[PDB]
Amino acid sequence: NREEKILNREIGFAIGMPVCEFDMVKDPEVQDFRRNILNVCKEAVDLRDLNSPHSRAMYVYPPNVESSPELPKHIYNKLDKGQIIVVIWVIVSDKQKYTLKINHDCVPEQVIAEAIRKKTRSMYQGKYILKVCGCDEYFLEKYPLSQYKYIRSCIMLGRMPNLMLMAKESLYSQLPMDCFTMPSYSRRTSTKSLWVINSALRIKILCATYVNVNIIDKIYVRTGIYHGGEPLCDNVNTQRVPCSNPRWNEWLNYDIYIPDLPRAARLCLSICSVEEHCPLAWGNINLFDYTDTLVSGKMALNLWPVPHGLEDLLNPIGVTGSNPNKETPCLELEFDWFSSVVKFPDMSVIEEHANWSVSREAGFSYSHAGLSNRLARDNELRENDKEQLKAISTRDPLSEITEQEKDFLWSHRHYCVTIPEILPKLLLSVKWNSRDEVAQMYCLVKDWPPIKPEQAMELLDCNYPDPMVRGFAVRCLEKYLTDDKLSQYLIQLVQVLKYEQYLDNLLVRFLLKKALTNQRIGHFFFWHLKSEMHNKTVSQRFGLLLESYCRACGMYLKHLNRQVEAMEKLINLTDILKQEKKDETQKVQMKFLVEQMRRPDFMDALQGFLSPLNPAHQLGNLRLEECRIMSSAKRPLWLNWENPDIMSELLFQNNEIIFKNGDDLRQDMLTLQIIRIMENIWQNQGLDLRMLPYGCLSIGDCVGLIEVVRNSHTIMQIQCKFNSHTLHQWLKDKNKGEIYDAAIDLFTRSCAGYCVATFILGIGDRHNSNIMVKDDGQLFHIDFGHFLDHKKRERVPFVLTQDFLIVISKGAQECTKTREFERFQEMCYKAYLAIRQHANLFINLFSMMLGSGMPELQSFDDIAYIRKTLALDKTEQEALEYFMKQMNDAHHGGW
């Protein structure tokens, strides 16, 4: 138990709260979560000690690979007859290099043998491993060399891959053997079915405590029964009462039969003032608990404050459950009593019912089917009907499905199985207050054909609360989501956890198992959860989840605790500079910083740890002379560490990170993720528009890290050394001679990609201080704090000034009327249309981010902006015409 107390101290330090605080939670759901999740921990630890030491090394250093070994035409043609030049370094005392020309699809074992052949010609194979020079990135698995992200990046950038031969035992001996230990908490009327209760739904509103307002006058409680965002019946209000005495003692009757209540049904309520009706406090509750039990008896629900922007009286897409703060409006509710415990029926009872319904419908006469548009006969399915179904399935997730299409999709639900990507539309067409239809939907979902992971992700958002539906989505992720794509969408998958009704669910088990079997996923999983630990709407869920992750991640908890301590020291320093030294000069502030940083406690916490931006990067000794307070808003810290890697000169000798305390970095994180997804779509279609999605990580409440791009300057820094020719002059000066055209091409291409990306996403206004350019000519944007409809009718955030057109047109006077400008336009058109073709992906990435309290992403109407910029109701020619007009009005001619 001495080991357990010390480990509980480590977990507490990592999570930010003491582990004893969980042990004090009375809630049986919380205690069952802590216990039951431990089998995911056990399965994951078993997988790691399955083929030791290799399986342990694969967990710690997973291959950083692309999803497909297939190289796009433009990328493959960058190779010399499908061959790549590679540099293999061998440490012999001294550093010896061996240059190899090998096929791109060579396995690391082939590369090692070719390297030993060259070393022998200068005068075993499975006793070595290839490492990337400069970082802790290893090639432990037998993939084609070009499938590794490092190599694919080298081919695309005309770079020389620098690999190092390392002895397997030099790596194996450095990987500590941890033993996962099961914690102390591992060792812990009648019952009737819901479908047997021949009664209507009723709930009693008793009274409200902690209703502190400005004597606001007459108040009432507004209630509704919801299934996700869909109302199951009409909303029921209490009688008006004075705020000075909030007492109702009233039963509210709902237009819903208790056996008709879906599994994920919720009571959505709010205390409203009044005619200008205004919500004061809101709260949501699950009608069934985690044990599938219908709510009974008395219950007190602590309510939440109204979000600035919500004018709606109820808030169904808000969080479910009581507010952890007990010094808030507290509404007492009483539920019905049935002289027994009521449970939702099990699968077998639901299947018997669905099979009974299917069989009964199959015997319906022509005239019976004619009574309802939701009933149709098997043989009466024409080729036109099948065409309309296929057409409906191509519509985007924000396209309204009329009541007629809903009846139509439901009556052809069996044909829908042949076009399985229609499932999200079919699910929104279901009568969720009819147990006959819901039971039939379950049986269709149970056996539904698998869909694409990016299509299944939609089924995990706020629109699909049903656990059978969510379980299907998770099964598609388990079978088809690669570790590369999981890493890419980890922020959306962590966000949708908030939409799970219960702590113990299929999604959380899938995510935890992946985090515990891949340290690269585990790292970002920990940081996305930890960064939101201040938010009291998810701190219990994320804290318990972090507790379970920290018990089984092994040795990585110790490395995480170094990054947590380094970040805390930096949060403490920046907090002092903004509260006690804000009005002092840069020199005075830098003197204060240098002194504080040099303290023994601080100095050691800020050196010798892994970059939270990229844990393959080691941060050694902090280089204090290169550290500075930046002139930008919130005055970020420019930080520089030595790369302690022996071959640091072959990658970067100093790792420079911007530490910023003051701004929400979540919108920046999402924009950068989208830019990368856009670039990925463009490269795959043979459209080389190189984007620069630099690293950005939120590490707490308005705190985070930004990856510094080396050899980059703002437009202002360029022109401050002014003519419109200054930018073109600088580029021509940085790329003198034969390499001039490559810079112009790179500028034009990066420029086209940023015009299209920023116009689609509606990014904040571009100016000279937030547009940067690398020496080689690569243009990129920084500071993505604003997106979508952030004003109140569509904007062009990136208006190409004379400066940009002069570069594009190679110094010509009439830049608007050149062949270079026409080709720049064609690049924009192609780019715009390609994104239009993947609209569902983008819409779903944003929809999964709605529970995240981001100011510009609160409703589906905020996401609707992307439907306008991508012109989705219009045809492809009309969408191109619309893009050209937006550009023309912004530029006052040219398009």
Ligand X SMILES: C[C@H](Nc1ccc2c(c1)OCCn1cc(N3C(=O)OC[C@H]3C(F)F)nc1-2)C(N)=O
d(CA 64, CA 67): 10
d(CA 707, CA 613): 7
How big is the site for ligand X, counted in residues (CB under 6 A)? 15
What residues numbered 272-331 form the site for ligand X, per CB under 6 A?
none
Ordered DSSP codes for 10-37: HHHHHHTS-THHHHT---HHHHHHHHHT
Least gap, CB of 760 to ligand X (angstroms): 20
Least gap, CB of 276 to ligand X (angstroms): 40
Rule CB under 6 A: choose which of 572, 717, 719, 726 binds ligand X.
Answer: 717
What residues numbered 61-80 form the site for ligand X, per CB under 6 A?
none
Least gap, CB of 441 to ligand X (angstroms): 46
The neighbour count for residue 366, using CB atoms within 10 Å, is 8
Rule CB under 6 A: choose which of 437, 783, 803, 862 binds ligand X.
Answer: 783
Least gap, CB of 593 to ligand X (angstroms): 16
Least gap, CB of 785 to ligand X (angstroms): 8
What residues numbered 675-714 form the site for ligand X, per CB under 6 A?
694, 706, 708-709, 712-713
* Residue placing its CB nearer to ligand X in the complex, 356 or 722: 722
- Token readout for 85 is 């030049």
* Residue placing its CB nearer to ligand X in the complex, 225 or 772: 772
d(CA 886, CA 895): 9
* Residue placing its CB nearer to ligand X in the complex, 708 or 839: 708
Q: Which residues contact 230 (CB under 8 A, 6 or more apart)?
A: 432
Write down how long the chain is: 895
**288 close to 246: Cβ distance less than 8 angstroms:** no
* Residue placing its CB nearer to ligand X in the complex, 147 or 770: 770
**379 close to 415: Cβ distance less than 8 angstroms:** no
Query: In 3D, which of 734, 695, 727, 690 has the Cα closest to residue 617?
Result: 695
Least gap, CB of 805 to ligand X (angstroms): 23
What is the residue whose two structure tokens read 């620069």? 692
Instruction: At 785, give phi and psi (nearest 5°).
Output: -70, -30
* Residue placing its CB nearer to ligand X in the complex, 692 or 760: 692
Strand-pairing partners, residue 302, are: 330
- Token readout for 201 is 């739904």
Contact between 782 and ligand X by CB under 6 A: the answer reads yes
* Residue placing its CB nearer to ligand X in the complex, 388 or 632: 632
What is the residue whose two structure tokens read 């998810």? 538
Contact between 769 and ligand X by CB under 6 A: the answer reads no
d(CA 282, CA 661): 31
What residues numbered 418-477 form the site for ligand X, per CB under 6 A?
none
Least gap, CB of 706 to ligand X (angstroms): 5
Site string for ligand X, 114-153 (x = CB under 6 A): ----------------------------------------
Least gap, CB of 746 to ligand X (angstroms): 17
* Residue placing its CB nearer to ligand X in the complex, 208 or 637: 637
Least gap, CB of 783 to ligand X (angstroms): 4
Contact between 789 and ligand X by CB under 6 A: the answer reads no
Least gap, CB of 664 to ligand X (angstroms): 12
* Residue placing its CB nearer to ligand X in the complex, 432 or 694: 694
* Residue placing its CB nearer to ligand X in the complex, 259 or 662: 662
Phi-psi region of 134 (alpha: psi -120 to 50; beta: other; left: phi over 0): left
Query: In 3D, which of 223, 201, 234 has the Cα closest to residue 315?
Result: 223
- Token readout for 179 is 């033993």
Least gap, CB of 709 to ligand X (angstroms): 4
Strand-pairing partners, residue 225, are: 267
Residue 813 half-sphere exposure, CB side, CA atoms within 13 Å? 0
3-state secondary structure of 274: coil
d(CA 182, CA 160): 48
- Identify the DSSP state of 617: S
* Residue placing its CB nearer to ligand X in the complex, 769 or 816: 769
Contact between 369 and ligand X by CB under 6 A: the answer reads no
**Residue least distant from ligand X (Cβ):** 632
Contact between 636 and ligand X by CB under 6 A: the answer reads yes
Site string for ligand X, 613-632 (x = CB under 6 A): -----------------x-x
3-state secondary structure of 48: helix
Ordered DSSP codes for 206-219: EEEE--------EE
* Residue placing its CB nearer to ligand X in the complex, 343 or 635: 635
User: Contact residues for ligand X (CB under 6 A)?
Assistant: 630, 632, 636, 658, 660, 694, 706, 708-709, 712-713, 717, 772, 782-783
